[PDB]
Amino acid sequence: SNMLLNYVPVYVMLPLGVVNVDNVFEDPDGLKEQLLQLRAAGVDGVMVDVWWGIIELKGPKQYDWRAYRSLFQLVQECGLTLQAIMSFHQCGGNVGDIVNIPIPQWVLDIGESNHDIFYTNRSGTRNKEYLTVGVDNEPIFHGRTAIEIYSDYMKSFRENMSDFLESGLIIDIEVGLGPAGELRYPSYPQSQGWEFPRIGEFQCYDKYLKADFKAAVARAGHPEWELPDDAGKYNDVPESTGFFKSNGTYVTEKGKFFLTWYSNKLLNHGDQILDEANKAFLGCKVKLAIKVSGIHWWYKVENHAAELTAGYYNLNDRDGYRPIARMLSRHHAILNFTCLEMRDSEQPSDAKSGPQELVQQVLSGGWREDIRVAGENALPRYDATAYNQIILNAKPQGVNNNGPPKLSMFGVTYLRLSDDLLQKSNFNIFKKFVLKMHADQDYCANPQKYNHAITPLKPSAPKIPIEVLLEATKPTLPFPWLPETDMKVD
Numbered sequence: 001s002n003m004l005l006n007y008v009p010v011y012v013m014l015p016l017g018v019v020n021v022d023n024v025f026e027d028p029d030g031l032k033e034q035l036l037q038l039r040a041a042g043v044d045g046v047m048v049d050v051w052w053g054i055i056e057l058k059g060p061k062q063y064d065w066r067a068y069r070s071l072f073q074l075v076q077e078c079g080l081t082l083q084a085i086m087s088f089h090q091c092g093g094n095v096g097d098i099v100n101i102p103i104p105q106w107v108l109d110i111g112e113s114n115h116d117i118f119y120t121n122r123s124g125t126r127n128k129e130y131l132t133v134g135v136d137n138e139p140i141f142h143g144r145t146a147i148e149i150y151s152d153y154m155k156s157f158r159e160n161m162s163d164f165l166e167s168g169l170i171i172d173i174e175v176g177l178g179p180a181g182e183l184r185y186p187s188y189p190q191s192q193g194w195e196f197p198r199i200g201e202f203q204c205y206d207k208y209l210k211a212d213f214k215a216a217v218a219r220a221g222h223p224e225w226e227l228p229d230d231a232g233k234y235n236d237v238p239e240s241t242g243f244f245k246s247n248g249t250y251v252t253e254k255g256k257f258f259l260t261w262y263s264n265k266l267l268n269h270g271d272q273i274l275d276e277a278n279k280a281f282l283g284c285k286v287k288l289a290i291k292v293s294g295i296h297w298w299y300k301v302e303n304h305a306a307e308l309t310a311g312y313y314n315l316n317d318r319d320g321y322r323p324i325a326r327m328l329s330r331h332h333a334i335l336n337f338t339c340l341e342m343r344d345s346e347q348p349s350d351a352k353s354g355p356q357e358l359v360q361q362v363l364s365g366g367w368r369e370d371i372r373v374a375g376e377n378a379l380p381r382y383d384a385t386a387y388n389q390i391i392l393n394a395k396p397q398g399v400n401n402n403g404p405p406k407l408s409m410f411g412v413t414y415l416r417l418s419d420d421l422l423q424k425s426n427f428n429i430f431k432k433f434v435l436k437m438h439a440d441q442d443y444c445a446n447p448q449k450y451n452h453a454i455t456p457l458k459p460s461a462p463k464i465p466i467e468v469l470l471e472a473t474k475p476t477l478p479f480p481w482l483p484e485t486d487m488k489v490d
């Protein structure tokens with residue numbers, strides 16, 4: 001079989017704020033000259049936040065889709081496809097966030113009087129960037145639950161954008177499930193003083209999560225068990241805590257129990273909302289996708305602290321990503337792994353960082369459960385080094401000259417299209433990165449040629465019970481990676 005079968009598409013995130021808080025598409029002319037450069041480079045499509053807080057600003061079910069319609073139209077004129085994020089989170093407190101976009105005021109307003117709608121840490125600090133899982137099903141938002149708000153929103157988006165959908169502009173709907181749109185707890189909030197190699201904190205202290213946890217321990221036989229109180233603070237290192245030190249609480253019956261409870265809330269949160277998404281886009285030619293954060297720090301210690309606090313119950317003897325993938329399988333969704341570029345040696349030694357190993361684990365787990373895997377770079381990079389790492393992850397075993405590769409990612413969405421990227425030398429490198437993703441082929445407008453035809457979304461398969469999800473915690477050996485890509489940019 002031909003070469004084109006090796007092709008891996010490349011998408012480019014649009015600038016934050018392209019449609020501003022006031023629901024105004026700010027500078028079409030400018031964007032337009034940018035997009036035209038991307039089309040010339042061979043870029044397949046672009047990715048954009050569809051901010052909940054801009055759209056449903058005025059009041060419940062007061063959507064204004066107008067400015068996004070304009071943007072989508074301009075994208076379509078430029079010959080590019082589009083990845084749309086249902087961004088139900090706030091823009092501002094995370095790395096790179098240059099614009100502030102909060103969640104809806106009417107929701108914020110409720111929170112002034114029910115503070116427990118937000119994620120809360122042990123100290124009682126409310127993080128307003130995303131509604132707590134604790135309220136997925138509480139009918140406190142003027143009669144709706146949070147999951148109903150998201151579901152209504154996606155329905156609305158589907159009806160109002162049906163022409164773009166039916167025209168094949170939109171290729172994938174990325175469903176936002178937490179801060180930065182990722183399925184995770186906001187355990188490393190810059191806005192609270194968290195700093196890089198920092199362990200982060202559990203975020204289950206809001207009233208609803210807490211009561212749920214209390215009732216669950218009581219049913220387990222230990223009504224007396226309580227939420228972790230020996231985990232430390234944002235910037236600790238694990239050895240310095242009772243929870244994460246060796247032989248600490250995390251390996252006790254109660255730590256295990258808490259941990260399982262805490263990581264299960266996410267799996268469940270993701271599964272219920274994807275259920276709604278599936279129903280909203282049923283029949284549309286689009287794939288659904290979720291975003292999983294790459295938390296590589298502490299990966300190389302037995303306690304995987306940062307992962308744990310973010311809600312990924314991953315250890316050396318318990319695969320805590322594979323279960324997410326198996327959950328995605330019923331929805332036929334793509335796991336978008338948000339960190340792909342980093343090399344272990346680029347990390348401060350004191351972080352016990354295992355970015356490359358984390359990647360192999362996560363993509364292997366995906367491929368093993370037979371779902372599609374995509375990903376992004378976590379930080380801005382312009383060098384061949386970044387690029388050649390993303391290319392290797394894309395096709396871990398190199399190109400197949402006589403057939404499709406045995407392993408390949410479904411797509412990669414590069415981190416942001418800025419002036420910097422478009423500067424002459426930077427851009428020249430980019431163009432090569434694009435070319436090698438495409439396996440040296442020219443940009444290929446019909447994805448069916450490279451075995452990416454899109455079909456109408458089917459209904460999810462049936463609910464997989466938690467037990468079964470949790471079987472996927474059995475560790476497996478990763479697939480073998482080459483050491484260097486066979487398609488270097490350099």
Ligand SMILES: OC[C@H]1O[C@H](O[C@H]2[C@H](O)C[C@@H](O)O[C@@H]2CO)[C@H](O)[C@@H](O)[C@@H]1O
Binds near residue numbers: 339
């Ligand atoms: O949730 C946002 C991102 O968080 C992590 O990115 C970190 C970098 O890996 C290292 C350092 O600069 O801090 C960043 C977080 O503030 C994660 O790696 C990404 O996948 C997430 O998108």
Ligand SMILES: OC[C@H]1O[C@H](O[C@H]2[C@H](O)C[C@H](O)O[C@@H]2CO)[C@H](O)[C@@H](O)[C@@H]1O
Binds near residue numbers: 016049090091291
């Ligand atoms: O515009 C998409 C997403 O970008 C930022 O979050 C990114 C992160 O900076 C890079 C990493 O590869 O993935 C995260 C999610 O894509 C913004 O913070 C986030 O709010 C925005 O939705």
